[PDB]
Design a protein around this ligand. Structure first.
Ligand SMILES: Nc1c2c(nc3ccccc13)CCCC2
Length: 288
């Protein structure tokens, strides 16, 4: 069995089928409108420049929804938004999106093609240590080698009244149970790491940092996954298992239990017509 992360193309398509069959984006957007305003309420106070650091260029459109909310609280204030993203393809796509929006004059972007870790070292090199008013790591800790050291480092870049927002799947979600029971049976990638809000809150408690945790229900429609042969129904299998051609490349004994289990309640909820997997998300906000 070859992990899904080893076939950039298969990944993408599978990843797209994920968004297209789930409330993933709507959920984050619900957060940006009903909660962010309150959170980023004073990160601009007394400053003639607002510095935003996004560790991850995959959510270009969320990065933008963020600015929107920040620009609304501080009319006229110039905003410096830096992005740390390893993938040239991601930065590229991000740039297209930026150029296609009419109205952002109070914003200056800068991209850095590197990893949160490479960026960290490079900075620890320069004598001076810059500060930020708002930092956010949306769904990318999975890809971080040393979490505790990352959490501590970026927290230390927080200026006055600054805040760091982190988003990962909730510890009370399908993902959790799924990983806890079958993870040890999927292709364990050197680069990926199954992580939920529980791991995070333990890590932050030990680190001694002060935070607040918000969970919002989100669901993934996995019905196509029960009609054997289905084209889409399998794209999602590949995503849930992050494994290339799950069906046609894995132990029948295994696919059997999952079939039974994905329909289980602690994994999904059966609603009118559809079977929804628990995609509950966690929003962690850390005070400087
Ligand atoms: N919902 C997501 C999951 C993973 N990566 C993601 C990366 C982008 C934002 C949504 C994601 C990896 C494992 C499980 C879930």
């Amino acid at each position: 069995m070859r992990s899904l992360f080893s076939d950039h193309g298969k990944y993408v398509e599978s990843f797209r089928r994920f968004l297209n069959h789930s409330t993933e984006h709507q959920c984050m957007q619900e957060f940006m409108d009903k909660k962010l305003p309150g959170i980023i309420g004073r990160i601009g106070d007394t400053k003639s420049e607002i510095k935003i650091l996004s560790i991850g260029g995959g959510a270009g459109e969320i990065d933008l929804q963020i600015l929107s909310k920040v620009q609304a609280q501080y009319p006229g204030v110039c905003i410096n938004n830096e992005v740390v993203e390893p993938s040239a393809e991601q930065i590229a796509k991000y740039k297209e999106l930026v150029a296609k929006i009419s109205n952002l004059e109070n914003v200056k972007f800068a991209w850095h093609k590197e990893t949160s870790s490479e960026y960290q070292s490079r900075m620890l090199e320069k004598k001076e240590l810059q500060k930020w008013d708002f930092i956010h790591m949306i769904q990318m800790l999975y890809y971080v080698k040393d979490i505790p050291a990352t959490l501590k480092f970026f927290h230390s870049l927080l200026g006055t009244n600054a805040k760091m927002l982190i988003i990962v799947v909730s510890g009370s979600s399908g993902w959790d149970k799924l990983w806890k029971k079958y993870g040890s049976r999927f292709p364990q990638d050197d680069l990926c790491q199954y992580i939920t809000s529980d791991d995070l809150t333990q890590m932050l408690d030990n680190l001694g940092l002060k935070y607040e945790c918000y969970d919002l229900l989100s669901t993934m429609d996995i019905s196509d996954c029960f009609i054997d042969g289905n084209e889409n129904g399998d794209l999602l299998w590949d995503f849930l298992t992050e494994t290339c051609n799950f069906n046609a490349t894995a132990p029948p004994d295994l696919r059997a239990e999952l079939g039974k289990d994905l329909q289980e309640p602690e994994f999904s909820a059966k609603k009118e017509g559809k079977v929804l997997f628990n995609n509950t998300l966690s929003f962690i906000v850390i005070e400087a």
